[model samples]
Target: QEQLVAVNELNENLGKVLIKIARDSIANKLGILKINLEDYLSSLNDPILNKKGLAFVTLETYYGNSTSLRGCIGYVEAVAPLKEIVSKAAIAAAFSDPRFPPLSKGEFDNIIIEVTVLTKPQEIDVENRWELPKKIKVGEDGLIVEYGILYSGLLLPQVPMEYCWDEETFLAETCIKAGLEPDCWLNNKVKIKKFQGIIFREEKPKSEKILIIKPSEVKCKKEEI
Candidate 1:
């Protein structure tokens, strides 16, 4: 159980690391183009592709869930001309000097920056809501789920839940358990709000066991009919 908790922590930290890498790479690319750093960072909140004639570049990362440690990396294929630059910058930001852990030969030395050129973001399906299952159990190490779908596989603009309005909602007590704050925008809002148009695939996995059980079971049973 403790191991799972530790793994989840690792995954979350890895996600943070990837996001930082993306942000830093974009900043570097923009700087190279003589664009303002603040403007570049702001643009990150939005979506922009570094395109070359037939190619474009994009970036994404995934952490399994609040309790799991596994993750996957993503890249954009149809990159713009600046795609190479962005890719280079991303590699530098993620695995190069001063920031990431030292790369090991053959294992970590050749850090590849995957890029994904994105299409314009569609509106989120504003009329839909994915209710959480009633019961979820945390594993021995205290994990409630094995996976979680973050952004869809498509390259689209997204705001991390932390940047969104419900910055106060708690997703896991363990975040606090691990000396981190218990706040997740994604956990608080996306499950409830409706958006216009967005193309995505469910990526994260749902918890197999109930982490929290509601006190009003009688009410829940009555409503479930």
Candidate 2:
């Protein structure tokens, strides 16, 4: 973590807008399919709004002490503007996430959204496959495990803390997430790319949203309200 830097801090207002726009993209007032965000983008001249970055959006049934994962999806290519990515990722998590059935208007009443803006993944250099887990820092590094094009998995920084995982466990689970053996991280052919994120989420079901300055810092199963 010595070389880490906070080079990608996200703008707060933009983060709020990201979640707000997602609410509409999931279901309009009349539950329409198409959408627009003209007046929303600082009248379309905001430079940060147009910059490219990956987006990860999660929809959940949230409570004071617990949160259930309804749907979560993202675009990691960083090929599109953050605003546009949020717009689509919201719809994707709500409707396109295959892990659960499509989100319905009824469920929208209680659903909360969490938005994550990702920086470009920096490829980590490890001298030996066995030394991989040792170099990884828990509660900080998000990992992408890939074995060619067919199998790949991504674990966000907060995920290890979410599961109370140590570095070895974190690497092992990432391999499993990619549908590989638990020890696949030991294989030299498997690739590991690490990245960090600026995360924001709703404090309550219908209240304001706030930045999670260091989501990786959160360590318990219960959220710190």
CA lDDT of every candidate: 0.28, 0.76
Per-candidate RMSD, Å: 17.9, 5.9
lDDT of 2 by residue, 133-200 (tens): 87778777889999999889899888899778899899899999999999988887888988777877
TM of each candidate vs. truth: 0.20, 0.62
Q: Global CA lDDT of candidate 1, please? A: 0.28
Error of 1 at 189 (Å): 31
What digit string (tens of lDDT, one per residue) describes model 1 on residues 1-225?
211111112222332333343445544543423555445544543112222212122222334342221112333333233333344544443444453343233322122223222222222233322222112221111111112353222111122122221212222332343333343212434322111111112132211221111111113122344
Candidate no. 1 TM-score: 0.20
Off by over 4 Å in 1: 1-80, 109-156, 160-225
Q: Model 2, residue 66: displacement in angstroms?
A: 3.1
Model 2 backbone overlap count: 0
Worst 10 residues of 2 by lDDT: 1-10
